[PDB]
Design an enzyme around this catalytic site. Structure first.
Site, mmCIF file in Angstrom:
data_model
loop_
_atom_site.group_PDB
_atom_site.id
_atom_site.type_symbol
_atom_site.label_atom_id
_atom_site.label_comp_id
_atom_site.label_asym_id
_atom_site.label_seq_id
_atom_site.Cartn_x
_atom_site.Cartn_y
_atom_site.Cartn_z
ATOM 1 C CG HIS A 49 -1.777 1.406 1.155
ATOM 2 N ND1 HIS A 49 -3.249 1.144 1.196
ATOM 3 C CD2 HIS A 49 -1.461 2.053 1.950
ATOM 4 C CE1 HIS A 49 -3.561 2.453 1.349
ATOM 5 N NE2 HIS A 49 -3.284 3.466 1.723
ATOM 6 C CG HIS A 73 1.697 5.027 6.031
ATOM 7 N ND1 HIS A 73 1.424 5.244 6.747
ATOM 8 C CD2 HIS A 73 0.458 3.430 6.153
ATOM 9 C CE1 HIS A 73 0.027 5.498 7.456
ATOM 10 N NE2 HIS A 73 -0.611 4.147 7.289
ATOM 11 C CG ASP A 74 0.831 3.939 10.194
ATOM 12 O OD1 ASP A 74 0.620 5.234 10.356
ATOM 13 O OD2 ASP A 74 -0.012 3.639 11.123
ATOM 14 C CD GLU A 77 3.922 7.686 15.916
ATOM 15 O OE1 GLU A 77 3.661 8.367 14.649
ATOM 16 O OE2 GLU A 77 5.263 7.689 16.556
ATOM 17 C CG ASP A 78 0.342 0.851 13.424
ATOM 18 O OD1 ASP A 78 0.491 1.985 13.839
ATOM 19 O OD2 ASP A 78 -0.506 0.410 12.347
ATOM 20 C CG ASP A 131 -3.027 6.747 2.266
ATOM 21 O OD1 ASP A 131 -2.491 6.064 2.668
ATOM 22 O OD2 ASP A 131 -3.672 7.269 3.855
#
Length: 322
Positions: A49, A73-74, A77-78, A131
């Site tokens: 993605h 991306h992320d 935090e993830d 996005d």
């Protein structure tokens, strides 16, 4: 398997090779490999993605920092890492953009955050817009009620935010996907009438390119007339209005390129004598956010509606190439 991940990385590489140097292409692909190192696709997948998002950005001739940020991306935090981007080759700017995008991911407080991020670094909004473009494409599986809710949020927030940051082609594409998910039958009815009337509207557009050329000659103004596509304007109108095939066949958009602002003003004056002025916007005296300048005029000659964008040669190269 990993054959999908590595095949996606090569698709990104085909886009970045033409305009980015090999040293920069090395960096962008290094971020792609790091995004996949952190990720195991346990969530119905996601490294691909962010790569699909980064391919949209790479197509808009975006800078290497923006592309690395999209791929990561992320990741702070993830994933089981934080402030790792600065420590990594990626560096401060990439860690900053990465954090900025997660910050943008309570109705009025969201609007404040979007607006604030635009003034900080528009590249955070440019990543957010790519996005949301990618999400609109992958909306198909969802229930028709849910699809029209995401489409409405994109229509109200992301379409005007994309015009605000200068990304007008991206906005037209987003707006198109919104109409498709808001009312598919309406979209299909209007796309069908557009297809039906396409040959005749092209025939009258060539006639009006000649009529406008003749007007410039008669009024002593040197210029160039460029045929402009106006499918999104016709769709935007007839998704909320009754169909009129004569009005749909006789509505055309043009770009008139002049030498001087004095000639732009001299042209608007000439047009006022031969047409009904339906709308006028002066973005020469009051440029659009992002510096782009033009005079926009909507005219009504009997039966025919013309949407013109008057600009100088210089204004046109500044808007198309910075």
């Amino acid at each position: 398997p990993g054959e999908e991940v590595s095949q996606a990385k090569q698709q990104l590489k085909l886009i970045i090779d033409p305009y980015l140097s090999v040293s920069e292409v090395e960096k962008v692909l290094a971020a792609c490999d790091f995004g996949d190192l952190a990720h195991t696709g346990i969530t119905r997948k996601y490294i691909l993605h962010p790569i699909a998002v980064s391919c949209i950005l790479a197509n808009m001739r975006l800078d290497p920092e923006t592309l690395m940020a999209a791929l990561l991306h992320d990741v702070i935090e993830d994933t089981q890492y934080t402030k790792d981007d600065i420590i990594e080759r990626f560096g401060q700017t990439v860690a900053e953009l990465v954090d900025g995008v997660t910050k943008l991911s309570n109705k009025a407080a969201s609007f404040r955050k979007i607006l604030q991020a635009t003034l900080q670094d528009p590249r955070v909004i440019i990543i957010k817009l790519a996005d949301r473009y990618h999400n609109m494409t992958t909306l198909g599986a969802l229930r028709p009620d849910k699809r029209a809710r995401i489409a409405q949020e994109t229509f109200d927030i992301f379409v005007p935010m994309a015009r605000l940051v200068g990304m007008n082609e991206m906005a037209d594409n987003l707006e198109n996907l919104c109409y498709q998910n808001l009312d598919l039958d309406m979209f299909d009815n209007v796309q069908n009438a557009l297809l039906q009337t396409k040959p005749e509207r092209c025939k009258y557009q060539s006639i009006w390119e000649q009529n406008l050329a003749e007007l410039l000659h008669n009024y002593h103004i040197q210029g160039r007339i460029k045929k402009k596509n106006n499918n999104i304007e016709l769709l935007r109108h007839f998704v909320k209005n009754e169909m009129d095939l004569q009005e749909l066949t006789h509505s055309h958009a043009f770009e008139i390129v002049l030498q001087s602002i004095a000639d732009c003003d001299r042209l608007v004056a000439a047009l006022k004598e031969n047409f009904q002025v339906i709308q006028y916007q002066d973005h020469i005296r009051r440029p659009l956010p992002g510096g782009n300048q033009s005079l926009m005029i909507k005219l009504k000659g009997e039966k025919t509606t013309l949407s013109l964008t008057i600009q100088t040669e210089l204004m046109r190269k500044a808007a198309r190439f910075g």
